[PDB]
Design a protein around this nucleic acid. Structure first.
Ligand code: NA
Ligand code: NA
Length: 326
DNA sequence: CCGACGGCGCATCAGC
DNA sequence: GCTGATGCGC
DNA sequence: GTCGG
């Protein structure tokens, strides 16, 4: 929090770029700057100081100078008071409502949740679900609840077919104390890249989770990817648990561990690992790890039966998810 | 100076 | 009706 | 907005 004022400012700017100006690359520039500053172990004294950090350029250095000298940023103060812009930025907090929808809603007088609640006919299925669980979705998930959630998912999956293999990834797998949602990767030996997916392997699992009333709503659902809502059972006489976001992806057996590695992260570790792999003559993406010829031509994907197989290929020591913060 | 900044499944729109 | 583009989330 | 070829 040494530079909380600065990081808060950059993050607020980031959101407006993304949600109002629809400049996704500026949104990411601000996030990157906020992150690099968030890790800086010194209270910044000037923009020049910050500019030394990778990601902080001329413009943000200038903004830090204004912030340090006046305690605010005129442009941010102005945008905050802007009725239209602050409303557009806000509505995007609803899952299903992006920059385009938020803009159209505000254009026609729909600026608040209350307004949204009054206009169900103008919201698609996803947006209605997002509105319904607006507050719940913004709540984090204690690891204890994530464990109780994993218990149900693993049990039911095995119940449908003991040959299914399911892994809850994300920061949770790395040991995080809280999570924002639940990411589940699923596979079955019967499903490979060059075989049939028996368009129901995913369906059968989603169905069982709905049957035991764990999954409560569906945002989207196809043959390989499910996105929805779930909720832990409440103990009689206790405030019921908040609804949570859960995604389930069915991945071909031969690409499963590249998927688990990828969705376990962190993002920083993935980049570092991808870099190391390249210098070792290997190209790793979320699906496979392939060899690179001397002319840069990628060969066919290499056999992978575990996360370690991946590490072994790039002569890197297997690292526990708990040690993949970077 | 000026292009990259990940890119793909699903729901829905837009053009035919 | 079918096909490709767009919005969205991740 | 920032970086870099
Ligand atoms: Na810099
Ligand atoms: Na949204």
């Amino acid at each position: 929090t040494l530079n909380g004022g600065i990081t808060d400012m950059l993050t607020e700017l980031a959101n407006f770029e993304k949600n109002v100006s629809q400049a996704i690359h500026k949104y990411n520039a601000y996030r990157k700057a906020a992150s690099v500053i968030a890790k800086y172990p010194h209270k910044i004294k000037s923009g020049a100081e910050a500019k030394k950090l990778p990601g902080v350029g001329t413009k943000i250095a200038e903004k830090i100078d204004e912030f340090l000298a006046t305690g605010k940023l005129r442009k941010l103060e102005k945008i905050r008071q802007d009725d239209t812009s602050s409303s557009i930025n806000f509505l995007t907090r609803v899952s299903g409502i992006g920059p385009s929808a938020a803009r159209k809603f505000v254009d026609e007088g729909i600026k608040t949740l209350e307004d949204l609640r009054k206009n169900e006919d103008k919201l698609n299925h996803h947006q209605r679900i997002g509105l319904k669980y607006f507050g719940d979705f913004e709540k984090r998930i204690p690891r204890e609840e994530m464990l109780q959630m994993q218990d149900i998912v693993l049990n039911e999956v095995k119940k449908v077919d003991s040959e299914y293999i399911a892994t809850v990834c994300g920061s949770f797998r790395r040991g995080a104390e809280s999570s924002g949602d639940m990411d589940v990767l699923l596979t079955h030996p019967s499903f490979t890249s060059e075989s049939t997916k028996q368009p129901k392997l995913l369906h059968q699992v989603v169905e069982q989770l709905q049957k035991v009333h764990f999954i409560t709503d569906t945002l989207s659902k196809g043959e390989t990817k499910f996105m929805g809502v779930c909720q832990l059972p409440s103990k009689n006489d206790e405030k019921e648990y908040p609804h949570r976001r859960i995604d389930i992806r069915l991945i071909p057996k031969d690409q499963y561990y590249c998927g688990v590695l990828y969705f376990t992260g962190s993002d920083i570790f993935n980049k570092n690992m991808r870099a190391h792999a390249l210098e070792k003559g290997f190209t790793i993406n979320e699906y496979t790890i392939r060899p690179l010829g001397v002319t840069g031509v990628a060969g066919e994907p290499l056999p992978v039966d575990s996360e370690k197989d991946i590490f072994d290929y790039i002569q890197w020591k297997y690292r526990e998810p708990k040690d993949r913060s970077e």
